[PDB]
Amino acid sequence: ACGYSDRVAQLTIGNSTITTQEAANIVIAYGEWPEYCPDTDATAVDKPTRPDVSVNRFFTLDTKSWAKDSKGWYWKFPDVLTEVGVFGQNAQFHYLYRSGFCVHVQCNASKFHQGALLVAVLPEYVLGTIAENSHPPYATTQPGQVGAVLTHPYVLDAGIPLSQLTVCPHQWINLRTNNCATIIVPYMNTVPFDSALNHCNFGLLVIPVVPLDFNTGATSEIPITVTIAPMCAEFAGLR
Amino acid sequence: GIPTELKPGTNQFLTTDDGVSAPILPGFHPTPPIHIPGEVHNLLEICRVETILEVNNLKTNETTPMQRLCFPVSVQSKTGELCAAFRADPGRDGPWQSTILGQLCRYYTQWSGSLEVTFMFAGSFMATGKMLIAYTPPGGNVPADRITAMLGTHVIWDFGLQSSVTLVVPWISNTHYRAYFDYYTTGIITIWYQTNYVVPIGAPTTAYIVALAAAQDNFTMKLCKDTEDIE
Amino acid sequence: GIPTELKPGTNQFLTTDDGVSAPILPGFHPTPPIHIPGEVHNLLEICRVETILEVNNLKTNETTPMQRLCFPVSVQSKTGELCAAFRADPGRDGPWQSTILGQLCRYYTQWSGSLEVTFMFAGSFMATGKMLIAYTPPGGNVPADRITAMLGTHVIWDFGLQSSVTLVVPWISNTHYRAYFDYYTTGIITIWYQTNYVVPIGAPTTAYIVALAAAQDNFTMKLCKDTEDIE
Amino acid sequence: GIPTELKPGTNQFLTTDDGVSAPILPGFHPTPPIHIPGEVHNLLEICRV
Amino acid sequence: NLIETRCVLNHHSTQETAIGNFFSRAGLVSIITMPTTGTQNTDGYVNWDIDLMGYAQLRRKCELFTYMRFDAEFTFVVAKPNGELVPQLLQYMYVPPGAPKPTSRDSFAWQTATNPSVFVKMTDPPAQVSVPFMSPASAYQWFYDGYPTDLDYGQCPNNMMGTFSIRTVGIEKSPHSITLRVYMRIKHVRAWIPRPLRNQPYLFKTNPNYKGNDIKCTSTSRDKITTL
Amino acid sequence: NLIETRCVLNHHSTQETAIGNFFSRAGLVSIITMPTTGTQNTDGYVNWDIDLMGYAQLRRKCELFTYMRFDAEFTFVVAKPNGELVPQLLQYMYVPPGAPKPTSRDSFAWQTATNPSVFVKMTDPPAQVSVPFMSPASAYQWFYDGYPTDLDYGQCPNNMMGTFSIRTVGIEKSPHSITLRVYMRIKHVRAWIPRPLRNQPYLFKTNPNYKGNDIKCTSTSRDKITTL
């Protein structure tokens, strides 16, 4: 997506402004643009609230630190912004929710660092455990803003090969060239509106496939910064 | 009534017969469908997607599998020495098993078409050097030295200029049979060090290459058969 | 004769198969029909009819059931106190069981649409006062006091001006399953005393409210299933 | 052949079923009819007497 | 319970709530048993008058309307009491209304051309037959607020649909016991004048009498009118 | 082996790789056994909830996609345990979702008109029936990253397709033991959002849990990265 030899740009959405290089090397998940839900009898008697206020803006999550031994990270949506800002209180008072997302993963490293991260979106990212029977805890199924760390990245903590994660909307971040990925994700579900608190429509994974390396003396931890922006977010309280 | 004569095959149940059965619930109107992005129509759509090849599938890796996803290059390696080698056998065992393509090939008996393998270099932006990629056609002698490989189908890849390069396996075919033997017509990809790994002071002296592969458009398969990948 | 092959399903009797049987009496001409007013074509025609809700379904009523048909308001009640409360769950047990709608819902597995509840005040023409009706959306906290209820979807009803008022439940849904649990998305209607009951000398200090309810046009149901209402 | 499925009622003999049976004598040409006055078509003709 | 998740945001088809779909499907309306010898079978035959108010399930459904008109499809599922089938020839005879019913295993009734009969082997697949709209009136009526001429109140004989007489064929009695299940399906339904749904247990087939000491409430109860 | 001769120089048909052809063919989805007397048969009936995640073979094929929509054709191949057939009348009843399942060999459930039932003799050719798309949602989903309200995680009840209740007809128990094979064929398939192929052995029907001590590699190994 974004790398060296790209004109720096300053994008602003609301009271937020991020400086990120303009690289029209964007990934549009499954080939579709986020849109406002088609008509349905439910919200035909109770229109869906479309708070364009402080909801359609740049939420920049806390920066994660990538070291020589990091295993990878993952966040669940919409969970990640459930405990944050007006997207949070807007996603809690309303029974039904629906939205899309512009996801922007970004790195800051020197040219003497090396590594490669795979950024992918996996719809309905259900997790497993080592096992006896025992469905994973609520603290690792819905990690929140902080996100969670993969324990067995090779099988994505779900018994499926990482080697095949690319059949999902992905984008590589090879420190050698580009330092940032961008992915546009549209709403995907078996019904127009779901609960923003019960179901997590998908997961964002950032797994280092080629480990961070550098010579002793250089900053030992590379910062990975995730910025999220809801697109065409709708809420239906039913009243 | 109408004079009819029951012919052989009457009363038989063929698991592959495609008939029409009585609807168990005639009054039921199934919930109507909506739009869900990403609908798949043919498995080949999936096969055209690059997945990671486990070229570095060593017996010593098994306990740290994450290392199979990429192999390395380093300064110790001398100009002209062989870096890695594997053949283009999607269906068979080996590196291809990790790819989505090789996994789907097991679900079929025959297949044929072109393949494309992509190599990505992950090392420091300060590193430079040239690797030689060579495809040895089916029924051909694997290159002995860098010089012979150069005389065959090859690609001089300078990762100081391009961080990635793609090779195209022109044509492979398979006709899986029993006696278990594969009528697999397939070449051998060989990666050579054209130059040694060059790097300045301050940069890692060991970097990694990631290999991705996928079937091209002309790739097709026939005759289904449940896999042996599960138990 | 015509070569035919009997396929699986031959000789079976499916209670839901819709075939054609031989007329037992071919020469008989059934008495012809005439016009009878009130022919019904779809059960939903019946569901759109307001029936009485037994909001006052107390355990102490059972022996004098006629009292369940209406609840009361009085002077003793203080401004702001909760009068009554029930949820909008047609299919489930409770007040809705008395309505024609709730009875027909048991004859189906799924349903969804809007509902409308009407409140009628029966007290002396000399009485006046205001009641606050509030609908708390599904998955919402039932109002704690009059003031919070007021902040949500509500209706200030002055029975000194209107003897009747109608509220509309925007949307309810159900997906009845077993394990017995209802995937019932439904709100809570709460009736509050905005003002106390005001009346002059000579008029009863206790009057009654009657509650009627019905499904709106967008209401629909699917998947039949014999009820559990009889034995 | 043509895929058929025998439905309930197969092999039954209904005394009121009105089917077609095989002609026992296909080559026979029944003596042709002539005019006989007084043919009756409906019993009600008799009831009006 | 009341799990408030998974909200159906689409309207379903109205076809499902149509009178026809509501009264479709073949249901069991009777179970005749003809043992070799026991209580009521040194006879060798059975007379089942076609009765709908048999199963309270279907009865309640019909008494939602005052008048109804329809055709009926009958399917005869027979076999021995344990489910086994044997090469037994049976005869099912439909005795219309106003016609004489068999009074013995060999009455003349069984030979009467006007009583349509269907012969089938217990091995053959279930026999199936359709009975039309028999009433002399424009519709069957589950309620008659008059007298057809007291103990004959509410009784309307114009709903009489006929009788089915079952028996094994042959001059000698059958060696096998037979358990026959009669299924009925209502075709081409038409209903008029909707009425309140029965909320009291049924006491008799022919009348709305209800237990007047134990009058059950239409709905369940709760403590306070505010607790929910 | 790798015999490099006989090279297929023609492209095959793409029809073979189409979602439909990949999920066609009737496969065995269940084997119910009803012995005269043993462990679970002093009952006389069986309740098999329709389950696809039964055979890992078909399950792996489905979990290649996130959402799927389709109709299902069921064929009932029954006979005694040794392959012999006898004149036994059987009944297969489909109990939709949200409907009450039989709890005894003679529950009222077996008479409920709304539970479609098919009666067939073990001698008659296999019974065949088609079940539609039951979910209240637009598609079945093999993965739900939420909770339907922990121990109820990943569990989506909107995939519930129904139950089949088998039993011999007749008031007395059947003298014969029955072994019934249930075949299912997926019709009109539609799939969405392709995902990685299961590479770890399955541990449970209802979740992706995998043995975390013995994590198997997607591919076999070799000595050097140059030996081939």
CSV table of N, CA and C in Angstrom, one decimal, chain C residues 95-162:
chain,number,residue,atom,x,y,z
C,95,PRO,N,-50.2,-11.6,29.8
C,95,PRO,CA,-51.4,-10.9,29.4
C,95,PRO,C,-51.8,-11.2,28.0
C,96,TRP,N,-50.9,-11.4,27.1
C,96,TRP,CA,-51.2,-11.6,25.7
C,96,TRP,C,-52.0,-12.9,25.4
C,97,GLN,N,-51.9,-13.8,26.3
C,97,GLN,CA,-52.6,-15.1,26.1
C,97,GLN,C,-54.1,-14.9,25.9
C,98,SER,N,-54.7,-13.8,26.4
C,98,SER,CA,-56.1,-13.6,26.3
C,98,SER,C,-56.6,-13.1,25.0
C,99,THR,N,-55.6,-12.5,24.3
C,99,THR,CA,-55.9,-11.9,22.9
C,99,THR,C,-55.9,-12.9,21.9
C,100,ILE,N,-56.6,-12.6,20.8
C,100,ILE,CA,-56.8,-13.5,19.7
C,100,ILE,C,-55.4,-13.7,19.0
C,101,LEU,N,-54.7,-12.6,19.0
C,101,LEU,CA,-53.3,-12.6,18.4
C,101,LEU,C,-52.4,-13.6,19.1
C,102,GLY,N,-52.2,-13.5,20.4
C,102,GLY,CA,-51.4,-14.4,21.1
C,102,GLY,C,-51.7,-15.9,21.0
C,103,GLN,N,-53.0,-16.1,20.8
C,103,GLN,CA,-53.5,-17.5,20.7
C,103,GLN,C,-53.2,-18.1,19.3
C,104,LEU,N,-53.2,-17.2,18.3
C,104,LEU,CA,-52.8,-17.7,17.0
C,104,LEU,C,-51.3,-17.8,16.8
C,105,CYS,N,-50.6,-17.0,17.6
C,105,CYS,CA,-49.1,-17.0,17.5
C,105,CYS,C,-48.6,-18.4,17.9
C,106,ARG,N,-49.3,-19.0,18.8
C,106,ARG,CA,-48.9,-20.4,19.3
C,106,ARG,C,-49.0,-21.4,18.2
C,107,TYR,N,-49.8,-21.1,17.2
C,107,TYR,CA,-50.1,-22.0,16.1
C,107,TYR,C,-48.9,-21.9,15.0
C,108,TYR,N,-47.9,-21.0,15.3
C,108,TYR,CA,-46.8,-20.8,14.4
C,108,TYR,C,-45.5,-20.8,15.1
C,109,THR,N,-44.4,-20.9,14.4
C,109,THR,CA,-43.0,-20.9,15.0
C,109,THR,C,-42.3,-19.6,15.0
C,110,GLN,N,-42.5,-18.8,13.9
C,110,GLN,CA,-41.8,-17.5,13.8
C,110,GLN,C,-42.8,-16.4,13.5
C,111,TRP,N,-42.5,-15.2,13.8
C,111,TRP,CA,-43.3,-14.0,13.5
C,111,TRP,C,-42.6,-12.7,13.7
C,112,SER,N,-43.1,-11.7,13.1
C,112,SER,CA,-42.5,-10.4,13.2
C,112,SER,C,-43.4,-9.3,12.5
C,113,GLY,N,-43.3,-8.1,13.1
C,113,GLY,CA,-44.1,-7.0,12.6
C,113,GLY,C,-44.3,-6.0,13.7
C,114,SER,N,-45.2,-5.0,13.5
C,114,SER,CA,-45.6,-4.0,14.5
C,114,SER,C,-46.8,-4.4,15.2
C,115,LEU,N,-47.1,-3.8,16.3
C,115,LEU,CA,-48.3,-4.1,17.1
C,115,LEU,C,-48.8,-2.8,17.6
C,116,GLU,N,-50.1,-2.7,17.9
C,116,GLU,CA,-50.6,-1.5,18.4
C,116,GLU,C,-51.5,-1.8,19.6
C,117,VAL,N,-51.2,-1.1,20.7
C,117,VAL,CA,-52.0,-1.3,21.9
C,117,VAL,C,-52.8,-0.1,22.2
C,118,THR,N,-54.1,-0.3,22.5
C,118,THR,CA,-55.0,0.8,22.7
C,118,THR,C,-55.4,0.8,24.2
C,119,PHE,N,-55.5,2.0,24.8
C,119,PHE,CA,-55.9,2.1,26.2
C,119,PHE,C,-57.2,2.9,26.3
C,120,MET,N,-58.2,2.4,27.0
C,120,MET,CA,-59.5,3.0,27.1
C,120,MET,C,-59.8,3.4,28.6
C,121,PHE,N,-60.2,4.6,28.8
C,121,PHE,CA,-60.5,5.0,30.2
C,121,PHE,C,-62.0,5.0,30.5
C,122,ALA,N,-62.5,4.2,31.5
C,122,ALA,CA,-63.9,4.0,31.8
C,122,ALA,C,-64.5,4.9,32.9
C,123,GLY,N,-63.7,5.6,33.7
C,123,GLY,CA,-64.2,6.4,34.8
C,123,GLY,C,-65.1,7.5,34.4
C,124,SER,N,-65.8,8.0,35.5
C,124,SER,CA,-66.7,9.2,35.4
C,124,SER,C,-66.3,10.3,34.5
C,125,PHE,N,-67.3,10.8,33.8
C,125,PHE,CA,-67.0,11.9,32.8
C,125,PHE,C,-66.3,13.1,33.6
C,126,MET,N,-66.5,13.2,34.9
C,126,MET,CA,-66.0,14.3,35.7
C,126,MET,C,-64.5,14.2,36.0
C,127,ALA,N,-63.9,13.0,35.8
C,127,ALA,CA,-62.5,12.8,36.2
C,127,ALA,C,-61.6,13.3,35.1
C,128,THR,N,-60.4,13.7,35.6
C,128,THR,CA,-59.3,14.2,34.7
C,128,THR,C,-58.0,13.8,35.3
C,129,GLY,N,-56.9,14.0,34.5
C,129,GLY,CA,-55.6,13.6,35.0
C,129,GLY,C,-54.8,13.1,33.8
C,130,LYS,N,-53.5,12.9,34.1
C,130,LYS,CA,-52.6,12.5,33.0
C,130,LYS,C,-51.8,11.3,33.4
C,131,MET,N,-51.8,10.3,32.5
C,131,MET,CA,-51.0,9.1,32.7
C,131,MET,C,-49.9,9.1,31.6
C,132,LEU,N,-48.7,8.6,32.0
C,132,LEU,CA,-47.6,8.6,31.0
C,132,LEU,C,-47.4,7.1,30.5
C,133,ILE,N,-47.5,6.9,29.2
C,133,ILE,CA,-47.2,5.6,28.7
C,133,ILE,C,-45.8,5.6,28.1
C,134,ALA,N,-45.1,4.5,28.3
C,134,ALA,CA,-43.7,4.5,27.8
C,134,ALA,C,-43.3,3.1,27.3
C,135,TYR,N,-42.7,3.1,26.1
C,135,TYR,CA,-42.2,1.9,25.5
C,135,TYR,C,-40.7,1.9,25.6
C,136,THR,N,-40.2,0.8,26.3
C,136,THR,CA,-38.7,0.7,26.5
C,136,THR,C,-38.3,-0.4,25.5
C,137,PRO,N,-37.5,0.0,24.5
C,137,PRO,CA,-37.0,-0.8,23.4
C,137,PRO,C,-36.4,-2.1,23.9
C,138,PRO,N,-36.4,-3.2,23.1
C,138,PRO,CA,-35.8,-4.5,23.5
C,138,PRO,C,-34.3,-4.3,23.9
C,139,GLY,N,-33.9,-5.0,25.0
C,139,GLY,CA,-32.6,-4.9,25.5
C,139,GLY,C,-32.3,-3.6,26.1
C,140,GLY,N,-33.4,-3.0,26.7
C,140,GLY,CA,-33.3,-1.8,27.4
C,140,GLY,C,-33.6,-1.9,28.8
C,141,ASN,N,-33.1,-1.0,29.7
C,141,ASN,CA,-33.4,-1.1,31.1
C,141,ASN,C,-34.8,-0.5,31.4
C,142,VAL,N,-35.6,-1.3,32.1
C,142,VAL,CA,-37.0,-0.8,32.4
C,142,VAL,C,-36.8,0.5,33.2
C,143,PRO,N,-37.6,1.5,32.8
C,143,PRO,CA,-37.6,2.8,33.5
C,143,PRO,C,-37.6,2.7,35.0
C,144,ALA,N,-36.8,3.4,35.7
C,144,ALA,CA,-36.8,3.4,37.2
C,144,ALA,C,-37.8,4.3,37.8
C,145,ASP,N,-37.9,5.5,37.3
C,145,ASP,CA,-38.8,6.5,37.8
C,145,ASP,C,-39.6,7.2,36.6
C,146,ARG,N,-40.5,8.0,36.9
C,146,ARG,CA,-41.3,8.7,35.8
C,146,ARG,C,-40.4,9.5,34.9
C,147,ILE,N,-39.5,10.2,35.5
C,147,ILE,CA,-38.6,11.1,34.8
C,147,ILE,C,-37.7,10.4,33.7
C,148,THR,N,-37.2,9.2,34.0
C,148,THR,CA,-36.4,8.5,33.0
C,148,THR,C,-37.3,8.0,31.9
C,149,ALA,N,-38.4,7.4,32.3
C,149,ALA,CA,-39.4,6.9,31.3
C,149,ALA,C,-39.7,8.0,30.3
C,150,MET,N,-39.8,9.2,30.8
C,150,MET,CA,-40.2,10.4,29.9
C,150,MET,C,-39.1,10.7,28.9
C,151,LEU,N,-37.8,10.3,29.2
C,151,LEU,CA,-36.7,10.5,28.3
C,151,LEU,C,-36.7,9.6,27.1
C,152,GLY,N,-37.5,8.5,27.3
C,152,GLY,CA,-37.6,7.5,26.2
C,152,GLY,C,-38.8,7.6,25.4
C,153,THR,N,-39.1,6.7,24.5
C,153,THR,CA,-40.3,6.8,23.7
C,153,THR,C,-41.5,6.8,24.7
C,154,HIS,N,-42.3,7.8,24.7
C,154,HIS,CA,-43.5,7.9,25.6
C,154,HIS,C,-44.7,8.7,25.0
C,155,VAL,N,-45.8,8.7,25.8
C,155,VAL,CA,-47.0,9.4,25.4
C,155,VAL,C,-47.7,9.9,26.6
C,156,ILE,N,-47.8,11.2,26.7
C,156,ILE,CA,-48.5,11.8,27.9
C,156,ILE,C,-50.0,11.7,27.5
C,157,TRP,N,-50.8,10.9,28.2
C,157,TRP,CA,-52.2,10.7,27.9
C,157,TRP,C,-53.1,11.4,29.0
C,158,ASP,N,-53.8,12.4,28.5
C,158,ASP,CA,-54.7,13.2,29.4
C,158,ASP,C,-56.1,12.6,29.2
C,159,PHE,N,-56.6,11.7,30.1
C,159,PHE,CA,-57.9,11.2,29.9
C,159,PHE,C,-59.0,12.1,30.2
C,160,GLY,N,-58.7,13.4,30.4
C,160,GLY,CA,-59.7,14.4,30.6
C,160,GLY,C,-60.0,14.9,29.2
C,161,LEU,N,-59.1,14.7,28.3
C,161,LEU,CA,-59.3,15.2,26.9
C,161,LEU,C,-59.6,14.0,25.9
C,162,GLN,N,-58.9,12.9,26.0
C,162,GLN,CA,-59.1,11.8,25.2
C,162,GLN,C,-59.5,10.6,26.0
